[PDB]
Design a protein around this nucleic acid. Structure first.
Ligand code: MG
Ligand code: MG
Ligand code: MG
Ligand code: MG
Ligand code: MG
Ligand code: MG
Ligand code: MG
Ligand code: MG
Ligand code: MG
Ligand code: MG
Ligand code: MG
Lengths: 106, 172, 197, 190, 136
RNA sequence: UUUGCUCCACACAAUAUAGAUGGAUACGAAUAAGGCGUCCUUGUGGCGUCGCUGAACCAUAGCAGGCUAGCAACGGUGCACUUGGCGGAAAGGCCUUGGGUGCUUGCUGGCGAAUUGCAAUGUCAUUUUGCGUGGGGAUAAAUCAUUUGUAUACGACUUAGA
RNA sequence: GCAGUCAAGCGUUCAUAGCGACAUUGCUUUUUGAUUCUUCGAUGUCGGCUCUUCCUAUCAUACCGAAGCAGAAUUCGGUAA
């Protein structure tokens, strides 16, 4: 197969924020194809990886991963909230994350 | 006020020794719920009689459902409202299937056209016009023509996506 | 869902299109806006010309080469609209505006690519019928844009070549649909129709 | 008040083909052809029986159904202008200086020149709109006849010839001098 | 010598106009316009498909091309009688619109093995289609 | 001229990534109108049909896709090479011709996969650079200093000099 | 200081060409009153000269509308800095 994807694409939109104060501990993720909080309830608990690259090779890989998970839904249009083990770096407001289908209940 | 609810509210003016069994005044009140319904009952009985809530009681409150909620009816509504510079009486006509939907249309209509809030408006009467040609307003006499049909030009279809690939058409 | 999204700016309202495009650029989607000279603005032409003259009368008093640079082209009018919908003084806003290209007409590569529309911004879907509207090319030419005729000539040539392409494409689509409708009433076609295809 | 459905009644005489596409009306009669672009109105044209065309506004306000009778009159003016034609007769009014109006040819453009308007050395040129033909009436003194298929072209060219002969810096109640429309009518009417 | 006027085909809001509810509890069921309340509000009734007789906006409603002869203000038994006499559901299910609704419901109801079979069959049909395209 | 410079191919390093993870999948115009198919007297034509979203279409099975045997067909597709035409708006791409060379899941078979141990992006992309190999290509100027005065506070400008 | 509304009246007749009493409603900060809010460990205090820019409540110039505008000259007003 030309496609080997086993995740759902998402975009790291922004941190959780008010008008003037942001919370870096909670990130907002726009999952592709979700346009409803009832659709977003499928992806709750699913693991998110933000896969990026570096130059220094640390454990035999120039590719590093930030792991986290979807916790709840955000708003009316299918944006969800994610929490990561270390928070997403805020230069990735607009970067792609991967929402894996595990831990699967369906 | 999602839809209004009509209540009969019956109140008494508390019985004394000189007058036991008082007179049981009754109204029809359009309100969101029984709290507002009893409040409006006392608001209008303080306009009509020497009674207030402390010196009276509510004996009954019952929701009056529509007798035929799926028959399209012409309603004449006599209403009194407070403008910015006076008090006026109006008579409007509302075509709808129930009295509470007609009164909701009236309240939206009055707030839109005359900027009249809920506090300004007294519903003096809602009565169904039982026969056509007692119907007095043109905007409701339009729909009482024989074999009425009209099209809906310029259909706008709501898209769920932020990008379309077709340059959409407004036919209907 | 595409690597870049080419938006045909014809028939769109400038602020609605710019509010769509600004959020998409900040969300990380690369956008080309072609044909920015057919963008509409609600309100009549004289209203929008007076609005641009109000914009034109304000520049830095002590040195006019520092003030609000009043860009005249329709693409730069749209880009001025889209700045101020993007937080452009930050690195995130500069990175988001680096994802945007706005053009007059449909130049090369984007002439041979699929152009999309944004129905939240389309004039025929948003304005009440009978409301007056202006066109960005006419407004730009009245405020001092010098290439309305060049864009029109090049657009007529583009339309001629694309119509030739579409005549060939209709011939091929006729052949393909004839071959597919022949393939109907077969066992494989009936099994696909059972599965919904 | 948002009237449900307003109708107007364009009657089409014999020999007249009123072909209407989207909102581009094309009226072809014995005198020629006329084309109008009514794409600014939002009305609906329906042909009934080849001698009648209804024009309609569905869910229209007062300012919208005001334009319906305007549209009916515009298509009626097209029909009348291609059956009977249009003919506007103008008179020259002067006190002392005779107004010398000729038709001149300037690199293929057909102007009407006006000399000696109030003793001016300025020659007032009015171009002739296409479709409008100009003649000067024999046996009627000081009359110019502008006739054509289009009431808009004919009446605007008559208005242009009037407005070029306006009096400046003088009491225009005394200096009544100019070219004025004395008649509006048709070419073959009886 | 013939007048030619284009006569734009609109689905009218009329009594007996079959509509398709797109929003709400019914949401994909047919009903019949029974009375017209105002420009934006009608009384519909969908007794075979289960839609209650109700006052609905014309914005939760898509007019279908189908129309059956129904008297104005007809009650639910009369609406069901005239509906089943005029065979509205059979005329609706033959249209290319209802076939598209049925097709996208079937596609969403496909399982993974059925999607695999769709792939295998699409490649099989593609072989014959592309083979005949070269010959013709 | 411490064999300099540049181009093409491959090999190895370093460098990073405003963020690949099946495909940016090309009419124009109107929206109180159109798209497609068909027919004719070729039109602002007749008839049929569709929309009510791309929820589409194309692609999509194989050790991240191995090795091998056939059947049917003469199709599909990749790679270089090649023939011709088109494209200047930022063309730098689009369409073709012929043979070669793989693959083919259109259909039927044979063998392999394990132990990454119950999951760890489990690494498959494309930017710049360097270095090295083997195949080509080209063989200048500019600045200071001297000079002019069409210039000039100084720079700069403008001239001249094997 | 400048506008506006009403109109008894002036204007040969005629309220409103141009004015307009008795009332009444506003604008501006270009005068002057009112405050004492900033400045008392220096904000240099009038006028002139010089020079630039801005406002329009337009004197002139451009184009016009009105008159008790015949012409000439005026008078009222509009766009206009
Ligand atoms: Mg944010
Ligand atoms: Mg396109
Ligand atoms: Mg300039
Ligand atoms: Mg004078
Ligand atoms: Mg394959
Ligand atoms: Mg001090
Ligand atoms: Mg000091
Ligand atoms: Mg100082
Ligand atoms: Mg002024
Ligand atoms: Mg003046
Ligand atoms: Mg100015």
């Amino acid at each position: 197969a030309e496609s080997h994807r086993l995740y759902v694409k998402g975009k790291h939109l922004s941190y959780q924020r008010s008008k003037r104060v942001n919370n870096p501990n909670v990130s907002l993720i726009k999952i592709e194809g979700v346009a409803t909080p009832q659709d977003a309830q499928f992806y709750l608990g699913k693991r998110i990886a933000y896969v990026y690259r570096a130059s220094k090779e640390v454990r035999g890989s120039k590719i590093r991963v930030m792991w986290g998970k979807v916790t709840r839904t955000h708003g009316n249009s299918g944006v969800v909230r994610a929490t990561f083990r270390n928070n997403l770096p805020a230069k990735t407001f607009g970067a792609s994350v991967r929402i894996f289908l595990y831990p699967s209940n369906i | 006020m999602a839809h209004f609810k009509e209540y009969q509210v019956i109140g008494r003016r508390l019985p004394t020794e000189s007058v036991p069994e008082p007179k049981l005044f009754r109204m029809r009140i359009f309100a969101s719920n029984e709290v507002i319904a009893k409040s409006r009952y006392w608001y209008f009985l303080q306009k009509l009689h020497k009674v207030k809530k402390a010196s009276g009681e509510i004996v009954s409150i019952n929701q009056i459902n529509e007798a035929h909620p799926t028959k399209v009816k012409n309603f004449g509504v006599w209403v009194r409202y407070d403008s910015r510079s006076g008090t006026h009486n109006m008579y409007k006509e509302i075509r709808d299937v129930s009295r509470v939907a007609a009164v909701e249309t009236l309240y939206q209509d009055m707030a839109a056209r005359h900027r009249a809030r809920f506090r300004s408006i007294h519903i003096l009467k809602v009565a169904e016009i039982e026969k056509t040609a007692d119907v007095k307003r043109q905007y409701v006499k339009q729909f009482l023509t024989k074999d009425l049909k009209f099209p809906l030009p310029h259909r706008v279809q709501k898209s769920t996506k932020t990008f379309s690939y077709k340059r959409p058409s407004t036919f209907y | 869902v595409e690597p870049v999204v080419v938006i045909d700016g014809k028939g769109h309202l400038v602020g609605r299109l710019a509010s769509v495009v600004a959020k998409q650029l900040l969300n990380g989607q690369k956008i080309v806006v072609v044909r920015a000279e057919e963008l509409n603005i609600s309100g009549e032409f004289f209203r929008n010309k007076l609005k641009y003259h109000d914009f034109l009368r304000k520049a830095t008093a002590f040195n006019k080469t520092r003030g609000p640079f009043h860009f005249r082209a329709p693409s730069r009018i749209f880009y001025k609209a889209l700045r101020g919908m993007v937080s452009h003084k930050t690195a995130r806003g500069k990175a988001a505006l680096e994802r945007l290209k706005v053009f007059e007409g449909i130049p090369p590569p984007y002439d041979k690519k699929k152009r999309v529309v944004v129905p939240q911004a389309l004039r025929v879907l948003r304005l009440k019928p009978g409301r007056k509207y202006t066109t960005l090319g006419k407004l730009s030419t009245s405020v001092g844009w010098k290439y309305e005729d060049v864009v029109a000539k090049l657009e007529a040539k583009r339309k001629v070549s694309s119509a030739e392409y579409y005549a060939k494409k209709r011939a091929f689509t006729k052949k393909v649909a004839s071959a597919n409708a022949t393939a109907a009433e077969s066992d494989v076609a009936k099994q696909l129709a059972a599965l919904g295809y | 008040m948002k009237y449900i459905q307003t109708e107007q009644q364009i009657e089409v005489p014999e020999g007249v083909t009123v072909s209407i596409k989207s909102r581009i009306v094309k009226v072809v009669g014995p005198r020629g052809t006329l084309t109008k672009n009514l794409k600014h109105i939002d009305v609906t044209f329906t042909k009934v029986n080849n001698q009648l065309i209804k024009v309609a506004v569905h869910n229209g306000g007062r300012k919208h159904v005001a334009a319906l009778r305007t549209v009916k009159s515009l298509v009626d003016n097209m029909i009348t202008g291609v059956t009977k034609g249009y003919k506007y007769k103008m008179r020259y009014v002067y006190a002392h200086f005779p107004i010398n109006v000729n038709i001149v040819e300037k690199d293929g453009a057909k102007f009407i020149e006006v000399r000696n308007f109030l003793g001016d050395k300025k020659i007032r040129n009015v171009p002739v709109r296409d479709g409008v033909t100009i003649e000067f009436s024999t046996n009627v003194k000081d009359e110019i006849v502008l006739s054509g298929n289009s009431v808009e072209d004919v009446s605007q060219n008559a208005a242009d010839l009037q407005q070029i002969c306006r009096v400046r810096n003088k009491d225009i109640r005394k200096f009544l001098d100019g070219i004025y429309v004395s008649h509006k009518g048709f070419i073959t009417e009886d | 010598t013939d007048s030619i006027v284009k006569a734009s085909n609109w689905r009218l809001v009329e009594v007996g106009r079959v509509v398709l509810i797109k929003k709400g509890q019914s949401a994909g069921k047919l009903a019949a316009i029974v009375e017209i309340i105002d420009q934006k509000k009608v009384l519909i009734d969908g007794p075979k498909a289960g839609v209650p007789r109700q006052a609905i906006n014309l914005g939760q409603v898509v007019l279908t091309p189908l129309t059956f002869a129904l008297p104005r203000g007809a009650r639910t038994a009369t609406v069901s009688k005239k509906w089943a006499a005029a065979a509205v559901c059979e005329k609706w299910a033959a249209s290319s619109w209802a076939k598209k609704i049925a097709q996208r419901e079937r596609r969403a109801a496909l399982t993974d093995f059925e999607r695999f079979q769709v792939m295998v069959l699409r490649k099989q049909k593609r072989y014959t289609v592309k083979k005949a395209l070269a010959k013709a």
